[PDB]
C-alpha cells in the first residue's frame, strides 16, 4: 500500500566520528567485502544470499555519531546514536533476537543449555503463536466449514 510510507528520503548527517584513528581504503574494502554475503534461515535450510546496498563505510554506518532521519516534530533534532553500552540489553539481544525455528529452541530447552535467559520467553511466545493459529481457525470452523486448500490457487 502507498499510504503510511515516506514520500521523501532525507539523508544521513554524521555528527561526530566514532574513532579517533582514520582507516585506510584497504580496511574499508576488506570490511565491506565481508558484509556483501549473509545467511538466511536457521536450519538444514540455510542459504547464502547477497546483500544489496552495502554502505560505503562500515565503521561509520550505524555504530555512533550518526543522526537518524527519523525526526518528527519541528524542533526535533535528528537523534544522534549513542555508545553501545548505553543501550539497554543490546548485547543480550545480539544473542537473543534472531530467526529461531521452534525445533531449534525446543532442543535447547530440553538440553537445558540456553544462550540467554530470554530464549525461554522467546520460545513460549512462539508456541503461543502457533496454537493461536489453531484457536483462530477453530473459531472460524465453528461458524462454518472452512476447508483447507480445496480452492484453486492463483489464476
Amino acid at each position: 500500500k502507498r499510504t503510511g510510507k515516506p514520500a521523501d528520503t532525507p539523508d544521513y548527517k554524521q555528527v561526530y566520528l566514532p574513532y579517533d584513528a582514520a582507516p585506510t581504503e584497504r580496511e574499508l574494502e576488506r570490511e565491506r567485502r565481508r558484509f556483501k554475503q549473509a545467511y538466511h534461515g536457521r536450519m538444514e535450510h540455510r542459504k547464502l544470499v547477497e546483500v544489496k546496498e552495502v554502505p560505503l563505510n562500515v565503521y561509520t554506518y550505524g555504530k555512533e555519531g550518526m543522526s537518524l532521519p527519523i525526526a518528527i516534530f519541528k524542533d526535533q533534532k535528528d537523534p544522534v546514536i549513542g555508545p553501545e553500552w548505553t543501550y539497554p540489553g543490546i548485547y543480550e539481544n545480539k544473542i537473543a533476537a534472531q530467526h529461531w525455528y521452534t525445533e531449534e529452541l525446543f532442543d535447547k530447552e530440553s538440553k537445558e543449555a540456553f544462550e540467554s535467559p530470554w530464549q525461554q520467553q522467546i520460545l513460549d511466545n512462539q508456541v503461543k503463536r502457533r496454537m493461536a493459529k489453531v484457536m483462530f481457525r477453530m473459531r472460524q470452523v465453528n461458524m462454518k466449514a472452512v476447508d483447507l486448500f480445496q480452492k484453486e490457487r492463483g489464476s
Binding site: 503510511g4 545467511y39 565503521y59 550505524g62 527519523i70 553500552w85
Partner: protein
Amino acid sequence: PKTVCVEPGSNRLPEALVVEKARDIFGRPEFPGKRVLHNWRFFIKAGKAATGPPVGQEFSKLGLKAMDFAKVFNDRTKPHFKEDVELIVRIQVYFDKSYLFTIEPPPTAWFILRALRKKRRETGPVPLRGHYCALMTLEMAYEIAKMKPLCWGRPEYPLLETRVRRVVGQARRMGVCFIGVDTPYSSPVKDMTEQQYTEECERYRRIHMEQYTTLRQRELEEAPLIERLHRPNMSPLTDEQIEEGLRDPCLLDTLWRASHPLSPYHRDLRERELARRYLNARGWVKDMTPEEMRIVFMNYRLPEGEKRKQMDEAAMSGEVYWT
C-alpha cells in the same frame, strides 16, 4: 573524540522536550464507557486534514459534518510538526454519534523506511526476492523503538529490551539484514582488539541483565497484588501426571499447597507433610526435599528478586495481616 553519555545503559527514553510535547499532543481522551459503533484508523499528514474522500465520505455515512474534526485536528497538529510526517489518527465513534480521536506517531514501517533511507517498493521479504535489503545495526532499531511506547504517560513500559525485538522482527519480515544478528560478528571497531571487544561485551551484558532485573522488579511491584501470588509451574510434572491431575482436582491443588513459598499463613508442617505424602501416594514427585520443591515449582515468569525473596523464610516472615 566526544562520546555523549558514557554509562552502563541509561539511554532509554528520548530527551525531555520530545517526551513533553508528545505527551500533550499524542494522548488519551479518557474512555467514556459508551457503546462504540465505529473504531476508525486513518493515515493523515500533519498540517492537512481534509473533508475529502476517506474521512469526508466516512463521516457523511453517519451524517456528521467532517469540517469540525478537520479543523480541531489541523489546529492541534499544524504547529509542533515537521511536514510530510503521516500520523495515525484513531477515531472512536459511540452510539450518541459523539466521537473521540487519538493521534499517534507514524507506523513502525515508516520509521524503518526512513532509517534505511528507503522509499516505497524498494524493500521486500527475502524468499520472495532472494537478496537482503539494506544492513541495519541494533543501534538504529533502539531509536526506532524508542518512539513507540504503549502509553506516553509512562514511556518506560513496555521495557525497551523487549519491544526492540518487535521492531527488529518487523524489519526482518521486510527483508532487512542485520549486523550483530543474522551475521556471526558485530560491526568492527577500529581502536580495539577482538578480545577487548568481547571481554567488554561479557561484563556489559551482565550489567544490563542486572539493571533490567531490578527494572521489571519495581515494575512488578507497581502492579496489582495477585501476580505476587502462587502460580506453580506445570512443566516439572510424567505427562500422564498432568492429565490425571486434570481428571481430578485434589492432585493439582494438594500440589499447589505442598509447593508454596513459606509464608506465615501457608507455613504449617502438619498439613504440608501429609499433602506431600498424599502426592507421594499416587506417585507424584517422590524424590523431592520440600525445600527443593519450593524451587522447582515457582512462578517462572516472575522476576528474580521477588522469587529469591519468596524462596526465603525471613523476607516472607514480615508480611502478616495485622488486625
